[PDB]
Each structure stands twice: as structure tokens, then as C-alpha cells.
Design a protein around this ligand. Structure first.
Ligand SMILES: [Ca+2]
Ligand SMILES: [Ca+2]
Lengths: 124, 107, 124, 107
């Protein structure tokens, strides 16, 4: 039932739009691995409140630790490595001004809904 | 930051990291239990070791960002994350050990 | 029987060494997805011959297209996206001096063998 | 390079890309067959479309690297990959279509 799952069922024309959305904005790997958690958070509020955005930034890093422990149980060495790279890059890219990560995440989720809007309107 | 990178490499591959994760395991056993401390205590041992090293690295990179960092800067960056640590008691424990490791390699 | 497969069977102490090896050298995703092909090529010769290295660089990009078509058949939208990102980054990073990609690949495969050497010597 | 990025976006989402992939499919059907042309001709249609767009992008980024690029530069970058194209006849076809698309957006 996740928005991420629904996006993946669209036709290639609209999947191409999702590709372009995730060209150097927010890492699509994290968007997928934390889909359920990301889709729960009030990124709109975080995008307008530095203290809340700071908590959500560090919440996200800890959620990636939880993902890591699942992939480790699954003996998935590459995704273990990718989770660790993902965490490092997020900290490099966003820790100085974490509110900007929330602005980007909210915006991506917004654009995803607009793409879904196209797909249901185009389907008729 | 050169010594940060070597500190982190020591944490993952060196005896420094074995000492770190044994300290953390006992401190997390000894703390008043939370859902998060219980899930760490229930992890398979090799996975727990990896997560604890990763959790320590997260706080090291919080306290030390840039080669320009001086120990004066530690206090602001700790207070910036203090409200987070208040709702994450396990992370408070790990931040204390990262603070000691980080202080010994900065200004 | 691949070297990549054998590395993943090592104990966490040695997997940590593989992590450090793939910290901003060559992307581990590509190392895994093209393990069989990468382990076949004479990267040592390519590291010493610009014209050969140039062919192998473009061979690698085309092998990523072949990987993409497999992940597409598997309906794996994230890895489709990751393959495309991987190709772009390789071209950005290495197309000006493709011989340097071969030097790095050969060196990584060399260091992997040295790590394996530790693991078999430490096991006794 | 701004127009390169918009050209590529047009290839993936615009009618320009639908025209490209129909041209490529027919040219690859019409060429003397190779193992590579056969596997492209045997691909499911949506996957074939994606790969052909990606293969075209690879050559566009070969001919245009940097906003500084001028059409004078095209010839060197084509000759640099010519020995590769000699053993990859399908890529030679795709390079020709990328050349035309790229020329119309550079010096
Ligand atoms: Ca309690
Ligand atoms: Ca033939």
C-alpha cells in the first residue's frame, strides 16, 4: 500500500519521470529502503522547523542502522556496504543545514503524487 | 580530517573497535532498559558489533566535521543534538563514548 | 566460484576490510553486478595501455546495459535507477582518462586477494 | 551543459525519444545481423526502448562533456571511440543517431 510500491506499478512512461525526479536530489536507495518510515513523517512541518528537522535527520540515520541490521541478517554484504555509504553521504551533504533535507524529501513525495496524478488521469 | 578517518578505520578493523563494542555492550546491558536497548541486546553478536561501530561513527562525524574542527566546537554540536539524545537513551550512551574518542584526536 | 562470492563468506573482521577497500575507490555495486565479467578482464594490461583501457571502459558501460535489461525483466525499479546512475558517474569520473579506471579496478582485485590471503592464513 | 541535460530528459520522457527509439529499432532490424543486434531485437519492447535511450545517452555524454564543448571537439571524441565501435556494430548505429542529436545542440 506504500506510495513507493504504487509508483513502481506505473507504465514505463511514468517510471521515467520518477527516474528524473531522483537525479541528484535525494538518494533513491534510501527512498526505497525506508519507504514506510519516510511516508509516515511530517516532512512539511520539518521543512519549516529547524529543531524538528534536526530530530528527523538523526531519526533517519538511526532508521538506516535498523535497515543495516536486517540486511546483515540476510547476509547481504553489498547492501550493508551501501547503507553505510548512504549514511556517510547524508551526513556530509545535510548535517550543516538539516532543514534542507526535509524540504527535499517533502518535495520529492509531492512530485511523486503529481506523477501518480498524471498516471490515473492518463489511464482514462 | 585525517585522524578522524584513521580513527574510524581503527574502530572497524582495529583492537580499538573491539574495546569500544565490548564497553558499549556492557553499558547498554547496564542501562535502564528501553525498547531500543533490548533490540540491541537481542542482536546476533556480529551484527550488534557492526551497528555499534556505525552508531559510534555517526556521533564522531557529528562532533568532527571538517579538518578545521577544534574542541571548542564540540559543545555546540552536542547541544544541537541534545533534544534527539533525550528521546534516544541508547544514543546518549554511544555519544558519550564517541565524545571521549573524538576529544583525544582534536584540539 | 567468483572471487566476489568467496569474499562474502569471510568473517566480519575481513568483511570490514572489504568495506574499507570500497570507500570511494570503485563503486561496490558495479563490482558485484559485473563480478563475473570484471574478474575475466586483463585489467593489468589495461592499466598499462590507453587504447585497450579505452575499449574496456566502454565495454563496461555496455555490460551495465546488459545488467539493466536483466533487472528490468525482474521489475526491479531501484536497481534500474542505480545502474543508470552508476553509468553516469563512471562517465563523469573516468572518461577523460579511462586508463585510471583500469588501474583502480586491477588494484581493488589485487587487494581483495591479499584480504583473502589474510583470511586463509588467519584460519589456521 | 544545460541543453544536454534537457536533450536527455527529452529522450527519456518526450516525443523526441519515441522517435529516436523507433528509428533505432528499424535501423537495428535492417543491419546485417550480429549477436548483439539479435538480442536487442529479441528484447521485450519496453525494455528495448529503455536500453536504446540509455545507449544513446552514453554516446551523447561521449561527444558532449562539459558546457565548453564545441562541434570541433566532436571529431576527436569520435575517433577516440572508433576502435570500440568497430567491434560493436550496433553501437556504431546508435553513435550515428547521437551524433545528429548532439550536433543540433552544440556550436
Ligand atoms: Ca525503561
Ligand atoms: Ca553477421
Amino acid at each position: 500500500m506504500s506510495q513507493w510500491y504504487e509508483l513502481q506499478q506505473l507504465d514505463s512512461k511514468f517510471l521515467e519521470q520518477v527516474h528524473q525526479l531522483y537525479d541528484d536530489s535525494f538518494p533513491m536507495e534510501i527512498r526505497q529502503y525506508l519507504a514506510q518510515w519516510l511516508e509516515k513523517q511530517d516532512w512539511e512541518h520539518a521543512a519549516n522547523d529547524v529543531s524538528f528537522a534536526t530530530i528527523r535527520f538523526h531519526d533517519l540515520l538511526s532508521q538506516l542502522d535498523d535497515q543495516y541490521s536486517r540486511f546483515s541478517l540476510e547476509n547481504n554484504f553489498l547492501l550493508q556496504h551501501n547503507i553505510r555509504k548512504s549514511k556517510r553521504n547524508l551526513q556530509d551533504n545535510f548535517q550543516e543545514d538539516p532543514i534542507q533535507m526535509s524540504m527535499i524529501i517533502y518535495s520529492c513525495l509531492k512530485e511523486e503524487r503529481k506523477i501518480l496524478e498524471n498516471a490515473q488521469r492518463f489511464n482514462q | 580530517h585525517h585522524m578522524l578517518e584513521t580513527l574510524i578505520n581503527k574502530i572497524y578493523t582495529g583492537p580499538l573497535g573491539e574495546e569500544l563494542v565490548q564497553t558499549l555492550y556492557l553499558r547498554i546491558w547496564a542501562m535502564e532498559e528501553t525498547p531500543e536497548s533490548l533490540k540491541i541486546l537481542q542482536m546476533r553478536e556480529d551484527i550488534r558489533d557492526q551497528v555499534l561501530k556505525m552508531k559510534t561513527e555517526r556521533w564522531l562525524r557529528t562532533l568532527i566535521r571538517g579538518e578545521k574542527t577544534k574542541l571548542k566546537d564540540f559543545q555546540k554540536r552536542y547541544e544541537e543534538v541534545h533534544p534527539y539524545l533525550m528521546k534516544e537513551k541508547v544514543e546518549q550512551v554511544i555519544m558519550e563514548e564517541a565524545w571521549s574518542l573524538a576529544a583525544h584526536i582534536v584540539q
